[PDB]
Symmetry: C2
Subunit: 224 residues, 2 copies
């Protein structure tokens, strides 16, 4: 049974509590929150939620020098989170320090958060990759490069498009998490067949008439 | 007029309060905190500090899609900080959104935080630039390109090394902040001479036997515009 993660887009604790109350029992609920929430809420907000049993993909895409990311990651791990992201663009050493940091901050009797690398953000078009980022390679090649390197450096997985998972998965093998966002009922069943380890789903659930029923139905479409 | 910013590399509010007690009157102190502190202490600690009159460079290097950075940046401007960072590698639109977010989150009356672009981190060597990040440009060209783009995208300044200021300035000009961290008694004097808008200083101050006097001496050196007589 592979996890379905609900992507949340909200900017306060109150909104967060409200959607979570609509998603189900805490143990059954895996959500993604980024900096729009984390930078707007008290430091103990995530910790309180993970104490209750909520699983949290805290998506802050850390991108700094290795020693600072060691310490950032370490601080995050003490929140009780399940997944977290770094930019592969920050390089091999930074990624390794990120994992060492996660290990260091994981409190007794907890699983170490999984370290996921971001490659090229979805906001990066072909033109931006070439003319703004001054990359030497086209998209498909840049992405595979970063993902491979992330795997070599101690990342547990990568955030990748559902339409890349096939070929990424071919290259890097089964010992890695391929976490695919942008899934809509690219359906959950297609993501399963193409090799996704976890799907991230937003509005189809969060904007649903009954977010809980939507969330539960996607899990079944993903795991049937 | 030109700021000296104290880099605080610590992970707890109690150690923070101790170094701060030695830096002087809050209205005379400008500090830099990054992931290490912020991800342990959170927003209340920053709000507390800025309300007292501390100037904070909150250095979190946001790097995400434009809409998310808009909201991240907006969240940070509510805290009353002075400088904050984003990755130029995140692209032109992300930088513009960051600045718009900063504007939206600033309380009325208050001053909009300055948006500073990170270019290539000091952790990226030429080999890392070439063979990990798959850049097609050599370091100096890539740095200038990222800096120029940041200027054209609403950034108020860049983080660069003291030595880089001249090339960046030559191309970008005076309506921009060149913020330079490597500084130790590259000296404050050299940083001044080379056109740094602001320096960040760490251990030379935070581990000095008298941090306040080390700080004031560096402010003085950095701002010695007419150090020598000339006619």
């Amino acid at each position: 049974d592979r996890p379905v993660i609900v992507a949340l887009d909200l900017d306060n604790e109150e909104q967060l509590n409200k959607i979570l109350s609509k998603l189900g029992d805490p143990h059954d609920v895996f959500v993604k929150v980024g900096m729009e929430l984390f930078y707007n809420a008290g430091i103990d907000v995530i910790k309180k939620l993970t104490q209750q049993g909520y699983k949290i993909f805290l998506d802050l895409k850390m991108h700094d020098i290795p020693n600072t990311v060691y310490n950032g990651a370490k601080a995050l791990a003490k929140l009780g989170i399940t997944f977290t992201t770094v930019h592969a663009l920050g390089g091999s050493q930074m990624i390794k320090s990120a994992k060492d940091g996660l290990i260091a901050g994981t409190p007794a009797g907890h699983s170490v958060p999984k370290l996921l690398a971001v490659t090229e953000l979805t906001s990066i078009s072909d033109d931006v990759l070439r003319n703004e980022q001054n990359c030497r390679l086209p998209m498909a090649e840049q992405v595979l490069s970063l993902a491979k390197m992330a795997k070599h450096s101690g990342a547990d997985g990568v955030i990748c498009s559902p339409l890349e998972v096939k070929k990424l998965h071919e290259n890097i093998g089964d010992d890695f998490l391929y976490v695919t966002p942008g899934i809509r009922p690219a359906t959950p069943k297609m993501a399963k067949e193409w090799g996704s380890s976890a799907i991230v789903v937003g509005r189809p659930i969060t904007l649903a008439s009954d977010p809980k029923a939507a969330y539960e139905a996607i899990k079944k479409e993903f795991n049937a």
